[PDB]
Paper text:
Furthermore, we developed seven derivatives of HOIPIN-1, and found that HOIPIN-8 is the most potent LUBAC inhibitor among them. HOIPINs are covalently attached to the catalytic Cys885 of HOIP via Michael addition. The benzoate moiety of HOIPINs is the key element for binding to HOIP. The carboxyl group of the benzoate hydrogen bonds with Arg935, and the aromatic ring of the benzoate hydrophobically interacts with Phe905, Leu922, and the aliphatic portion of His887. The aromatic ring of the methoxyphenyl moiety of HOIPIN-1 and the 2,6-difluorophenyl moiety of HOIPIN-8 stack on the carboxyl group of the benzoate moiety and the guanidino group of Arg935, respectively. Furthermore, the two pyrazol moieties of HOIPIN-8 form additional interactions with HOIP that enhance the affinity. Thus, the 1H-pyrazol-4-yl at the 4-position of the 2,6-difluorophenyl moiety forms a hydrogen bond with Asp936, and the 1-methyl-1H-pyrazol-4-yl at the 4-position of the benzoate moiety is accommodated in the hydrophobic pocket formed by Phe905 and Leu922, and stacks on His887. The benzoate, 2,6-difluorophenyl, and 1H-pyrazol-4-yl moieties of HOIPIN-8 interact with Arg935 and Asp936, which are located in the LDD domain of HOIP. Arg935 and Asp936 in the LDD domain reportedly interact with Glu16 and Thr14 in the acceptor ubiquitin, and the Ala mutations of these residues abrogated the linear ubiquitination activity. Thus, HOIPIN-8 not only interacts with the active Cys885 but also masks the critical residues for acceptor ubiquitin-binding.
Author numbering: 867 to 958, 966 to 1070
The structure:
């Protein structure tokens, strides 16, 4: 459970306000609560091959919630299903039961999310159900690339390998697809600070 600041290792409550940014008020580190990579202010990123240095950003692995939050729950579910990882669709105007950080820290009672709870999202709202799915995905180290289209695979290859890939002479789309995926998985690890098992 919880969020550890990757710099000073102070433990925080696993409490994401719909946002991946986390600021350690102990040591002032700024990092992604999804992959524990540093966040950088504009022009501050010290990575020499960074192509977005003028932007406020961090560098995320492809299985960070930063990215996978943008998937549909259906597709996330597909990744889990394909790997025989079980998840809830049902709970065991109340709204989402995830308890968030209280607006008043010394408050007595917990504050539930309360948001709309889609049918089949296990009594969670959309964002929280997705976060749940991704925690399962990350826990079992599932590779989202396994479900990429060729376009996604090209994106990923440029992003993580810094090469623009192109089909070979007489390479069909399936063969091209499998070639990009093979190299991606072979050369680019999943999140290295994402908690596993
Ligand atoms: C002060 N500060 C905040 C940030 C920061 C950087 C990134 C994100 C992020 O989650 O991407 C956030 C969280 C707040 C935010 O702007 C935000 C967002 F940009 C996108 C999303 C989002 C995108 N898809 N689904 C949700 C949610 C957010 F809360 C905040 C950096 N500095
Ligand atoms: Cl919100
Ligand atoms: Cl990607
Ligand atoms: Cl990483
Ligand atoms: Zn810290
Ligand atoms: Zn991240
Ligand atoms: Zn950068
Ligand atoms: Zn919720």
């Amino acid at each position: 459970n919880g969020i550890d600041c990757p710099k000073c290792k102070f433990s925080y409550a696993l409490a994401r306000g719909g946002c991946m940014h986390f600021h350690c008020t102990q040591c002032r580190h700024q990092f992604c609560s999804g992959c524990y990579n540093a966040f950088y202010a504009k022009n501050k990123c010290p990575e020499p091959n960074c192509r977005v240095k003028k932007s406020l950003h961090g560098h995320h692995p492809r299985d960070c919630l930063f990215y996978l939050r943008d998937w549909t729950a259906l597709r996330l579910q597909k990744l889990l299903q394909d790997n025989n990882v079980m998840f809830n669709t049902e709970p065991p105007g109340g709204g989402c039961r995830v308890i968030e950080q209280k607006e008043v820290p010394n408050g007595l009672r917990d504050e539930a999310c309360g948001k709309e709870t889609p049918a089949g999202y296990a009594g969670l709202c959309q964002a929280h159900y997705k976060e749940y799915l991704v925690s399962l995905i990350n826990a079992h180290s599932l590779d989202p690339a396994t479900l990429y289209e060729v376009e996604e695979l090209e994106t990923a290859t440029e992003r993580y390998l810094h090469v623009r890939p192109q089909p070979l002479a007489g390479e069909d789309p399936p063969a091209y697809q499998a070639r990009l995926l093979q190299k991606l998985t072979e050369e680019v690890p999943l999140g290295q600070s994402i908690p596993r098992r």
